[PDB]
């Protein structure tokens, strides 16, 4: 299993991005890590679609999963440099044959220019 990410990069302040994470099931989540800081959960989604957000990010970030195409998305709006970070998707599964597995995307740099 591999998670492949897209949709980030440089973006002007006030702009918006839609990150994608394609798993080439289980709960998934988006995390971010800014330079010199620890990882933080931005949003997660259960197999059945229940969502959880970092309280302070809920108003600008939305997580969704496309089950027809197998794509996880993070819509992020009204950005500032406070949102500059590497963003990572995660898929954490528990199956019958293999047991537990934990998969991460390669990371997507988002750089908001002010």
Author numbering: 2 to 25, 31 to 120
The authors write:
Dali homology searching had previously located a similar secondary structure within the Ebolavirus genus NP, two of the three alpha helices being identified as forming a dorsal “V”-like shelf and a much smaller, shallower basin, well upstream of the C-terminus. Here, we characterize a trio of semisynthetic anti-Ebolavirus sdAb previously selected on live virus preparations and known to recognize the C-terminal region of NP to define the determinants of cross-reactivity and specificity. X-ray diffraction was then used to solve crystal structures of sdAb–antigen complexes and unbound sdAbs. In our present study, we show the consequences of this FR interfacing in recontouring the sdAb surface to be more accommodating to undulating and convex antigenic landscapes, bypassing the need for a concave epitope.
We coexpressed the His6 tag–deficient sdAb with KIHis6-tagged NP C-termini in the E. coli periplasm to form antibody–antigen complexes in vivo and also used periplasmic expression to produce the His6-tagged sdAb alone to obtain the unbound forms of the antibodies. Finally, substituting the sdAb ZE for the sdAb SB, partially disordered because we have 5 amino acids missing electron density in CDR1 for the unbound form, we see a more conventional elution profile for the sdAb in between the sdAb ZE and sdAb ZC, which should result in the complex with SUDV NP634 migrating analogous to either of the sdAb ZE complexes if not slightly slower. A substantial amount of restructuring occurs in the CDR3 loop between free and bound sdAbs, with a more compacted unbound loop tending to splay out in a toggle bolt–like manner.
